[PDB]
Design a protein around this ligand. Structure first.
Ligand SMILES: *Cc1c(COP(=O)(O)O)cnc(C)c1O
Ligand SMILES: *Cc1c(COP(=O)(O)O)cnc(C)c1O
Lengths: 396, 396
């Protein structure tokens, strides 16, 4: 009986959405979105995906079940994007890939698999990290611990506090890493720091799990993958949960993958069978549509070329707005220095505003931001930059 | 580390698939499929869904995330199909619906929700039942117990052994019911038996969970729902996991729903919030495509009319083959009586063949059936009926 069931907490982000929609003030700006938006303030379906879809419409002859691990080409294509077209992991057949319901579904199947087939008890999440991370791992029965990441003073990665924090993790603990475009600081380890991280991980015996949801949004498709690749060249085992929601704009089609890398082919195949058992007891097999779309774009020269151009366009816009933001705030005049905004990657970053300030920005100006000061750079258009920066200057 | 991970058992059904494909004998017949096939032996994408898809292609402007519970029209449309267009459950707002990744995903979210938000410890599954039932419930941490169902001698429902078995279930135990087209016996309770079941359930305090994957395949869309409706008119609470994989032929698009019915609006909303928290920690939000397709067909008169005709066509074919099977076996002459085949519903039923017989049917004749004697009626075409019935007669 559910007569005494207690209501789940209203998730903060969902809340802002309803408060903003109900905001009668015509000059309102929503910077707590979580999705990409163009200069127009819209999240269109990519031209390359629309072409891929017309194609599927013309050529699909059946809607019959996919295998537990999804469409094969899709799996192969993602392994190449993650590790490189000619990696030893691919040639030596050390990795297996399951197509899953988004990047979140990939984290939950990893979690379920880890929980029932291994002795892992804790997962180390960065502080701060994407809030749903904790909920996924806790739901599978794993304990979540946090390692230090952000440096509130300097707006940077506290690498000392980072390596110092992880010394509390024992061999066999999983350590969660954001491949690029750290949600929500936008702060990423540099290559030197990734190599230092990869080496230390091997030494202490961490099981690295990578959350790779923004490949292509920081510097490029291959550039963004070198941190993961620095760990892959050094570990016998690792798991990578990837998403295509943002880089393909396929949010609601739920397309991602869970990649298991083992010491060798024989062992990865044996572990993957248990990962497939984990999937069968959850959703059975994955949704074909969005994954089919990804597989036909990546497998076609013309379509892939158009998609890559559409991805660089999004990446550049997000980089344009970070610059515009920093200096439009300067032209508004105030002891500040939001220049650190320029060094961060992706759509998110902490503005450095207090909850005191974020609250009045909203009530007094109708500029919506997350209580943590998180601001989505894609919510900014060259049109709303001045009226945005003026609101920020007034609360400083 | 996965170096000592033990391989998951090869799932029997997956096995036959590979043995059949590798069967060089040109007269091979596969009756252990699990999906629908037309007279041609193909599983085409319905004409109504193809139209729905061209429409979505022309009119979709964004692929941005759906809410945790899915597309609203989709939810409303399923509540109407399940309980009737003017039910008190709908008018009194006692039910809430989440769009999920297939009927299997609906069972796993029900399981997760039940496991963390209530005191349910066991789930009662029929004997036999769909094998993945046990895996879903066990994965959420629930215990699975079995109540008697089939009567191997008479090829019927042992209703005595049924009511007698359930007396071992205490108030607070969940009891799983197949809405129609029981997988795999095809044997369903009659209305009188459903009312007796609904009444006894209330009395002992069972939490009924309905697995409704074949609405429309037994007698009709509304006819098939009266068993569930006999429980709904009598219970304050219940859960229904429905699938659109088979009745819409949307297998790989993963479209189903999990419907929570509570005593009143206030309580269903409070419990549903926890059901949404269960979804957020699993896959986040659901896949739009297949559900969008279902919502546009059901919401449109023309398209819905075509779909219903396509569904009755499948239902009638499956009913044609059950007749053809029974008497083509008679024309082959043998002390038998597969007439019980005519009283069973859906694509499946137990042929009454022993594993001894199913094994030689396969090795000697290349007729593939499940070791339990389960046979998919949709694997039969008027063309393969004679060479099928002759193989069966020869092993009898
Ligand atoms: C957006 C996001 C995800 C989710 O991916 P989905 O494909 O939407 O489920 C996972 N991890 C991080 C860090 C994300 O920001
Ligand atoms: C086919 C089936 C399901 C699965 O539905 P999906 O939509 O494929 O996940 C669930 N229960 C029963 C009894 C089924 O036969």
């Amino acid at each position: 009986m559910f007569e005494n069931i207690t209501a789940a907490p209203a998730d903060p982000i969902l809340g802002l959405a309803d408060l903003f929609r109900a905001d009668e003030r015509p000059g309102k700006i929503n910077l707590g979105i979580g999705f990409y938006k163009d200069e127009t303030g819209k999240t269109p379906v990519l031209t390359s995906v629309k072409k891929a879809e017309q194609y599927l419409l013309e050529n699909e002859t059946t809607k019959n079940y996919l295998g537990i691990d999804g469409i094969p080409e899709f799996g192969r294509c993602t392994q190449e994007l993650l590790f490189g077209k000619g990696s030893a992991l691919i040639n030596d057949k050390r990795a297996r890939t399951a197509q899953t319901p988004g990047g979140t579904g990939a984290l939950r199947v990893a979690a379920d698999f880890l929980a029932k087939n291994t002795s892992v008890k804790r997962v180390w999440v960065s502080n701060p990290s994407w809030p749903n991370h904790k909920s996924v791992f806790n739901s599978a029965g794993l304990e979540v611990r946090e390692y230090a990441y952000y440096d509130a003073e300097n707006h940077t990665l506290d690498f000392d506090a980072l390596i110092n924090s992880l010394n509390e993790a024992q061999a066999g603990d999983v350590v969660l890493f954001h491949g690029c475009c750290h949600n929500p600081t936008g702060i990423d380890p540099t290559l030197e720091q990734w190599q230092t991280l990869a080496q230390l991980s091997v030494e202490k015996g961490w099981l690295p799990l990578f959350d790779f949801a923004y490949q292509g949004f920081a510097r490029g498709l291959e550039e963004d993958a070198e941190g993961l690749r620095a760990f892959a060249a050094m570990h016998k085992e690792l798991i990578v949960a990837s998403s295509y929601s943002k880089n393909f704009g396929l949010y609601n089609e739920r397309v991602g993958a869970c990649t298991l890398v083992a010491a060798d082919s024989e062992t990865v195949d044996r572990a993957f069978s248990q990962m497939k058992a984990a999937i069968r007891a959850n959703y059975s097999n994955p949704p074909a549509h969005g994954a089919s779309v990804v597989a036909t774009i990546l497998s076609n020269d013309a379509l892939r070329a158009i998609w890559e151009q559409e991805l660089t366009d999004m990446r550049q816009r997000i980089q344009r707005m970070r610059q515009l933001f920093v200096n439009t705030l300067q032209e508004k005049g105030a002891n500040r220095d939001f220049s650190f905004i320029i060094k961060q990657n992706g759509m998110f970053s902490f503005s450095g505003l207090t909850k005191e300030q974020v609250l009045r920005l909203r009530e007094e100006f109708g500029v919506y931001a997350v209580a943590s000061g998180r601001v989505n750079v894609a919510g900014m258009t060259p049109d709303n930059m001045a009226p945005l920066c003026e609101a920020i200057v007034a609360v400083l």
